[PDB]
From Swiss-Prot, chain A:
The keyword Heme does not apply. Heterooligomeric complex of about 850 to 900 kDa that forms two stacked rings, 12 to 16 nm in diameter. The lineage of its organism: Eukaryota, Fungi, Dikarya, Ascomycota, Saccharomycotina. It is found in: Cytoplasm. Molecular chaperone; assists the folding of proteins upon ATP hydrolysis. Known to play a role, in vitro, in the folding of actin and tubulin. In yeast may play a role in mitotic spindle formation. This is T-complex protein 1 subunit eta. Gene3D superfamilies: GroEL, GroEL-like equatorial domain, TCP-1-like chaperonin intermediate domain.
Swiss-Prot record, chain B:
The gene is CCT5. Its main location: cytoplasm. One of its GO terms (cellular component) is chaperonin-containing T-complex. Belongs to the TCP-1 chaperonin family. CDD domains: TCP1_epsilon. Heterooligomeric complex of about 850 to 900 kDa that forms two stacked rings, 12 to 16 nm in diameter. It is found in: Cytoplasm. This is T-complex protein 1 subunit epsilon. The keyword Cytoplasm applies. Keywords: ATP-binding, Chaperone, Cytoplasm, Nucleotide-binding.
């Protein structure tokens, strides 16, 4: 009659560890096509009904929301990969899951997982030491300031639809990173706006901030769109004649009183409307719509206004001209105003776009992209995001290691020799760790269409011949040196990946039982 | 969270399910691709039944949960803004590339090699069409409008327009010329207002430069025409959001009248309000008073003595359309009236249509405007919407013909010439591209075979017949017999498509085919 769990499912034993292994393979198998710049993209449909397609492991695992506890640990460690580094969230989960696959036959042989986890901790400790030996300090050495940024951005943009126009896109990509303080570089500070229509090579770089120009209200052919030093005013409240929401009940029996209450509704609005002119600002920006009466009164005094501007764009305006948002039109102070070097409304893409240009106080920028289709430009923007992260980390981190299979093979190469000196179960565990490091160069060839059998075996040949820098060429299929091909990643990525993947692996291998309470 | 209601398709069984799912959606509109294509019955969620062959309507009316098919809807959505006539053609062409891609997957070829194969296939086919294209406006202006007028007659032959098509084809030519400039050469469809109403026939549909508000002028005694007013500048009208009358409260009325004295006092307020409003019209020099709300009958009586015709109950969006044609402004109140804010037109009159009791109005210009209004009529609702969208389809063709003078004859001709050129160059490439280019040429052959299946002809026999005529003799444009003629030549038959339209059709089709193959995993959750 009595029950221990009161109907709360709890399972233990070696079968629970196997169930944790199958969960790590399921998460790995989903991220395998998303590994590498040429890797395939995953189709994810969230319960929010927003269909997204991306290859970035961070965004992928955040939108899946896997309830499985052992599989959720691989998601939590991927968010740590997005925190400590921010790049490589796809490879850290695949490598951690591969450690679960290589530890599966050891569980059937009767080898305890604690000796397996202890073997990885000694393997990573030797692996990080080899990465420090593979860390090459380079700043001005055999490279200039311009060639270091350009030649590294061309490789990230290679094998893409932008390959032919890459010469123009590297110039805007390098100038985008140099437009910000090299001490603190944030990808969020670089704005990117997609412009439908037009040629890809005609894209422009804006030093200031731009937005969509969502103003739908009539009164056009006025309010000149080109200003030299406009005074930008950030507004909150609603200046439209006929208001959005509220109202009032007024009972009057006279005809002159009918026109009076209509003029009263006008005078109450015109009061705060005239206070905008008393500030003497040429640009009026508000997150709420600016009605026909307001845009007409601004047209007579030659004041430009745009309503219903996104909040994300208004925050960049504050970071551009150094202004501030004031709630009312009365108390507006002079320091809340701001000014740019040039203001123009561009018709590029058969659509009107307001832009601020030449802001000396701007901590952010905006880069416009053009193309024949909105989906193609989105691929250009994401291929640019991969190029920005390489250019950004090049200045922030001067210690680099050869990527694209180069470093992955050298770490796996030496640990096979280090395992010869160690005897016992730890020898087969280190050999399994070095074998688990072979999944990274493998999936890079499988996702790009290259043959995994020939290229990997040929890579194991020349790399064993005394040259440590041989990677996998992503352009023309062959083995080659990525140090010459300029495939570069900082040493902190390879160190934090081996530390985070083994950590998440050690947390899952240490779980004998999963207790889930229902309620 | 919520492990249930989550399905995952990956690897082996995913690639086969994606192609067959896109094939089922494409097989819907295959038979609807052509001038002879078959209609479909579409039922709105409100219960209305409509019958049309338009691909933009069928794909939008169809509600589907397939994410791969949603990419097909986004494919036709982006091209509809660019072109609009390639809706059903791009999906069948993209699915034909998917059907050939599925065959290459079964042969052991990776999807990345297939995507890179179709990429080099498009770049080679574009260069072949760029050499064989011809120009129209490069010859003569009268000859341009000759080919321009006959090009609209071709696109209107698949619709009920075909009877009166000679009239609607001239409408597509005249409507574009007015919204375009010789130096700018920019054709914008927003500058052309498409408007239609039920009743009459398609023979009564005219083309007028101006706007029509469909109003009887609020009173029969007011004249049916408006004079220039003794040497004034055109005819000045007012665009206002307030009616001509004593204004009324929008909450409650409940006016209490104690005796006859209070009723006679409101007579003076109502009479003096009339004089204050009419004086604002005479000082501003305005002829016709156009307002958003109706007018008082006693107010219209004084307008008869002052020779001031008035128009009441005009929509807000209709008020903005007058300010575009007449270069006017929307004026909130009577005291804001000024000569610069009044719309300046040539004249205003009420035009009677046959015995119909509608009796709309027409505001004219007599000089080139920034907007035009296409007037469309029909014996039935669906007839009006068909003739309106068929004329809009011709406007999209004229827009591409002016933007790009390079033209090709596209029906059944282009897919064969593209296939014959790629098939010959497939042997010289010698690699994975050889299977990709051979399947690319076979996927292009789907379009002319589909047209032959919709016209009642052998898709295999007609396709090869078009090939042998373009090989043994010379490379030219010889298309499918769908419309009919003594021969299959598309030149003398005057069936033409824009070269920039054919290039964007084969581009976006190859682009999405690479995006569908770009997806190696599909994870779809439920609705929480």
């Amino acid at each position: 009659i009595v029950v221990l769990k009161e109907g709360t499912d709890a399972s233990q034993g070696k079968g629970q560890i196997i169930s944790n292994i199958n969960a790590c393979v399921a998460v790995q198998e989903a991220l395998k096509p998303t590994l590498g710049p040429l890797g395939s993209d995953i189709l994810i449909v969230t319960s929010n009904q927003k269909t997204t397609i991306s290859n970035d492991g961070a965004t992928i695992l955040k939108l899946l929301d896997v309830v499985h506890p052992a599989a959720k640990t691989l998601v939590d460690i991927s968010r740590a990969q997005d925190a400590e580094v921010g790049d490589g969230t796809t490879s850290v989960t695949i490598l951690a899951g591969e450690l679960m696959k290589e530890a599966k036959p050891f569980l059937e042989e009767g080898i305890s997982s604690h000796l397996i986890m202890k073997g990885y901790r000694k393997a990573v400790s030797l692996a990080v030491e080899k990465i420090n030996e593979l860390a090459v300090d380079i700043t001005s050495e055999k490279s200039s300031g311009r060639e270091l940024l350009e030649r590294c951005a061309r490789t990230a943009m290679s094998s893409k639809l932008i390959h032919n126009n890459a010469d123009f896109f590297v110039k805007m990509c390098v100038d985008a990173v140099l437009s910000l303080d090299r001490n603190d570089l944030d990808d969020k500070l670089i704005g990117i706006k997609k412009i439908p229509g037009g040629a890809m090579e005609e894209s422009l770089f804006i030093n200031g901030v731009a937005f969509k120009k969502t103003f739908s209200y009539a009164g056009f052919e006025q309010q000149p769109k080109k200003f030299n030093n406009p005074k930008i005013l950030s507004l909150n409240v609603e200046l439209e004649l006929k208001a959005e929401k509220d109202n009032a009940e007024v009972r009057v029996e006279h005809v002159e009183d009918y026109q009076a209450i209509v003029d009263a509704e006008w005078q109450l609005i015109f009061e705060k409307l005239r206070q905008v002119e008393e500030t003497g600002a040429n640009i009026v920006l508000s997150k709420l719509p600016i009605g026909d009466l307001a845009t007409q009164f601004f047209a007579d005094r030659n004041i430009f206004c745009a309503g219903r501007v996104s909040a994300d764009d208004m925050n960049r305006v504050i970071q551009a001209v150094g202004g501030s948002i004031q709630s009312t039109t009365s108390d507006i102070k002079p320091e809340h105003l701001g000014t740019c070097a040039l203001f123009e409304e561009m018709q590029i893409g058969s659509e009107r776009y307001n832009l601020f240009q030449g802001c000396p106080q701007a901590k952010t920028c905006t880069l416009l992209l053009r193309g024949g289709a909105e989906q193609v430009i989105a691929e250009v923007e994401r291929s640019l995001h991969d190029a920005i992260m390489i250019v950004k980390r090049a200045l922030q981190n001067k210690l680099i290691v050869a990527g694209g299979g180069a470093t992955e093979m050298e770490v796996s190469k030496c640990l096979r020799d280090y395992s010869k000196t160690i005897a016992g179960k730890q020898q087969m565990i280190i050999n399994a760790f070095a074998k688990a490091l072979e999944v990274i160069p493998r999936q890079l060839c499988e996702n790009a269409g290259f043959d995994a059998i020939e290229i990997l075996n040929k890579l194991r040949l020349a790399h064993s011949k005394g040259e440590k820098w041989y990677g996998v060429v992503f352009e023309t299929e062959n083995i080659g040196d990525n140090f010459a091909k300029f495939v570069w990643e900082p040493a902190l990525v390879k160190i934090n990946a081996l530390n985070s993947a083994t950590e998440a692996t050690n947390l899952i291998l240490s779980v004998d039982e999963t207790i889930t309470n229902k309620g | 969270k919520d492990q249930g209601n989550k399905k995952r398709q990956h690897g082996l069984e995913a690639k086969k399910s994606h192609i067959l799912a896109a094939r089922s959606v494409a097989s819907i509109i295959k038979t609807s691709l052509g001038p002879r294509g078959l209609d479909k019955i579409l039922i709105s969620p409100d219960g209305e039944i409509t019958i049309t062959n338009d691909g933009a309507t069928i794909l939008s009316q169809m509600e589907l949960d397939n994410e791969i098919a949603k990419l097909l809807v986004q494919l036709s959505k982006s091209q509809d803004d660019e072109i609009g006539d390639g809706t059903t053609g791009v999906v069948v062409l993209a699915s034909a590339l998917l059907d050939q891609a599925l065959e290459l997957i079964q042969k052991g070829i990776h999807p990345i090699k297939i995507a890179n194969g179709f990429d080099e296939a498009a770049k080679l086919a574009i260069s072949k069409l760029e050499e064989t294209c011809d120009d129209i406006s490069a010859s003569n202006d009268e000859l341009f409008r000759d080919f321009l007028l006959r090009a609209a007659k071709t696109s209107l032959g698949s619709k009920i327009v075909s009877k009166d098509h000679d009239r609607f084809a001239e409408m597509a030519v005249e409507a574009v010329i007015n919204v375009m400039d010789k130096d700018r050469k920019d054709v914008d469809f927003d500058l052309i207002k498409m408007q239609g109403r039920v009743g009459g026939s398609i023979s009564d549909s005219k083309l007028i430069n101006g706007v029509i508000l469909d109003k009887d002028f609020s009173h029969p005694q007011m004249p049916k025409c408006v004079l220039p007013k003794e040497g004034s500048d055109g005819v000045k009208l007012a665009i206002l959001t307030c009616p001509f009358e004593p204004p009324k409260p929008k909450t409650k009325h409940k006016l209490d009248i104690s005796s006859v004295e209070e009723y006679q006092k409101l007579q003076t307020y109502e009479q003096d309000k009339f004089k204050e409003m009419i004086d604002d019209v005479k000082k501003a020099g305005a002829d016709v008073v156009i307002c958003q709300w109706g007018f008082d009958d006693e107010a219209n009586h004084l307008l008869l003595q002052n020779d001031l015709p008035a128009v009441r109950w005009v929509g807000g969006q209709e008020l903005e359309h007058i300010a575009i044609s007449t270069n006017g402004r929307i004026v909130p109140r009577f005291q804001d009236l000024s000569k610069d804010k009044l719309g300046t037109c040539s004249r205003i009159y009420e035009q009677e249509f046959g015995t119909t009791k509608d009796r709309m109005l027409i505001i004219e210009q007599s000089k080139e405007t920034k907007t035009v209004t296409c007037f469309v009529r029909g014996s039935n609702k669906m007839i009006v919407d068909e003739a309106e969208r068929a004329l809009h389809d011709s406007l999209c063709v004229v827009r591409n013909l002016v933007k790009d003078s390079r033209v090709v004859y596209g029906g059944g001709a282009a897919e064969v010439t593209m296939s014959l050129a790629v098939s010959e160059e497939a042997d010289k490439q010698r690699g994975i591209d050889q299977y990709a280019f051979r399947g690319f040429a076979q996927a292009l052959d789907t379009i002319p075979m589909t047209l032959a299946e919709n016209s009642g002809l052998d898709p295999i026999g007609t396709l090869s017949t078009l090939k042998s005529k373009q090989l043994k003799e010379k490379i030219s444009n010889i298309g499918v017999d769908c419309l009919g003629y003594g021969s299959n030549d598309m030149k003398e038959l005057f069936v033409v498509d824009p070269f920039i339209g054919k290039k964007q059709q084969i581009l976006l089709a190859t682009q999405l085919c690479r995006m569908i193959l770009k997806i190696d995993n599909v994870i779809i959750s439920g609705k929480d």
